[PDB]
Amino acid sequence: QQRGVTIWLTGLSGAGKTTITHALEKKLRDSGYRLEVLDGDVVRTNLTKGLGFSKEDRDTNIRRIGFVSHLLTRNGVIVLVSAISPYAAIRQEVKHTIGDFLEVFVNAPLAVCEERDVKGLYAKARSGEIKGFTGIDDPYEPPTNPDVECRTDLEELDESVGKIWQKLVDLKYIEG
Amino acid sequence: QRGVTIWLTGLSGAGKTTITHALEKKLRDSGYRLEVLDGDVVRTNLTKGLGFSKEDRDTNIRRIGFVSHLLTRNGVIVLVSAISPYAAIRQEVKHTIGDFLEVFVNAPLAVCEERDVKGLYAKARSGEIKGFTGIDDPYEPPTNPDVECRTDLEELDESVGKIWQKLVDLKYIE
Numbered sequence: 165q166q167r168g169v170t171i172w173l174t175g176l177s178g179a180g181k182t183t184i185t186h187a188l189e190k191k192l193r194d195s196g197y198r199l200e201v202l203d204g205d206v207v208r209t210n211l212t213k214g215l216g217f218s219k220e221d222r223d224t225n226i227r228r229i230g231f232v233s234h235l236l237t238r239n240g241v242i243v244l245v246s247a248i249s250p251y252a253a254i255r256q257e258v259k260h261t262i263g264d265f266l267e268v269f270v271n272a273p274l275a276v277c278e279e280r281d282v283k284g285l286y287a288k289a290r291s292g293e294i295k296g297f298t299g300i301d302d303p304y305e306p307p308t309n310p311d312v313e314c315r316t317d318l319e320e321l322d323e324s325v326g327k328i329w330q331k332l333v334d335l336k337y338i339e340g
Numbered sequence: 341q342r343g344v345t346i347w348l349t350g351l352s353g354a355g356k357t358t359i360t361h362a363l364e365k366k367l368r369d370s371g372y373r374l375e376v377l378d379g380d381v382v383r384t385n386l387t388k389g390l391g392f393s394k395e396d397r398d399t400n401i402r403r404i405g406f407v408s409h410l411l412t413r414n415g416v417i418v419l420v421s422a423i424s425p426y427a428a429i430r431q432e433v434k435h436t437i438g439d440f441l442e443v444f445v446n447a448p449l450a451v452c453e454e455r456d457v458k459g460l461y462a463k464a465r466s467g468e469i470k471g472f473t474g475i476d477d478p479y480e481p482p483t484n485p486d487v488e489c490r491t492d493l494e495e496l497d498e499s500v501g502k503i504w505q506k507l508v509d510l511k512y513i514e
């Protein structure tokens with residue numbers, strides 16, 4: 165049994181949002197659930213191609229992802245969003261529009277993300293090669309009341325996915 | 341019942357929006373699950389910021405196709421109303437979506453220009469607006485649409501009826 169819902173992963177670059185998204189996607193698909201993934205890194209090559217990382221463009225980006233997530237959710241689809249989405253007021257705006265919405269705070273310390281520097285972006289932010297990088301010289305406003313929080317430096321992947329899954333069960337979006 | 345994109349293409353003023361709304365009502369009143377993506381409306385949200393250059397119309401149509409695809413493959417009936425003047429781009433979206441009906445809303449340029457519903461034809465003729473479809477920008481008519489509605493020669497009910505019957509024939513609806 166399946167009801168529409170947007171599962172919204174927010175957090176720093178490198179915090180592990182994509183990894184959780186993919187593991188959660190697999191778990192859901194293997195149970196027969198109907199889903200769509202909207203990953204910021206990927207949709208910025210199509211749906212939101214042309215946008216940069218100014219405040220205006222991040223707002224446009226998140227609002228556009230929210231638009232598509234809303235249409236899918238209200239038609240019964242489970243939508244997995246993975247996007248830095250650093251502005252709380254914008255996340256709240258999307259949550260309010262969609263209603264069936266779960267905010268997942270993928271919470272890793274800045275220092276941990278910077279040490280791994282998976283795509284080399286932190287070093288480029290520090291040197292000034294890149295301007296306005298989230299967490300270094302651009303805001304990240306952490307969720308104050310997320311529905312699920314995953315402290316990825318302190319919990320195993322299965323534990324993080326498990327908490328999202330259990331929340332979906334508790335709220336009866338998927339079968340227990 | 342089955343997902344499908346119903347894609348209305350045609351000149352400004354040809355009657356696309358009127359057919360869309362009438363079709364939407366008929367589908368909803370029969371219990372069907374749908375979404376409408378009207379070019380005039382999505383250009384205030386989904387495609388806000390784009391103009392009417394070739395590259396912007398391509399971006400516009402491709403982005404509408406992106407959303408239509410995700411909805412269609414999840415069982416939703418999607419009604420698109422957009423000038424979509426480039427045949428190759430309509431074909432590209434049709435190919436991506438698969439379950440796609442191209443509806444040619446075909447009114448003569450002269451009929452659309454004489455009504456000039458939004459005053460845009462007069463603005464195109466004076467040069468107030470540049471690159472207006474059918475006046476100084478292309479419209480490439482479908483050569484093999486799934487349904488054609490000659491709105492200057494058909495009653496609204498007849499145009500809607502043909503789209504409905506096509507949906508029935510192809511088993512998208514009961």
Ligand SMILES: Nc1ncnc2c1ncn2[C@@H]1O[C@H](COP(=O)(O)OS(=O)(=O)O)[C@@H](O)[C@H]1O
Pocket residue numbers: 177178204205208217221222223225226246247248249250283285294295296297298302
């Ligand atoms: N200035 C930047 N700030 C954050 N991420 C950036 C920046 N420049 C490039 N990126 C890349 O863009 C990705 C973030 O895109 P989004 O999740 O779509 O951002 S968001 O702020 O608009 O939500 C990061 O994973 C990173 O790879």
Ligand SMILES: Nc1ncnc2c1ncn2[C@@H]1O[C@H](COP(=O)(O)OS(=O)(=O)O)[C@@H](O)[C@H]1O
Pocket residue numbers: 352353379380383392396397398400401421422423424425458460469470471472473477
């Ligand atoms: N240069 C223009 N050409 C066509 N339509 C225009 C133009 N400028 C403003 N408009 C308005 O924009 C609408 C067309 O938008 P679309 O259907 O989204 O066009 S499309 O070519 O990109 O598919 C028309 O109904 C008309 O009202």
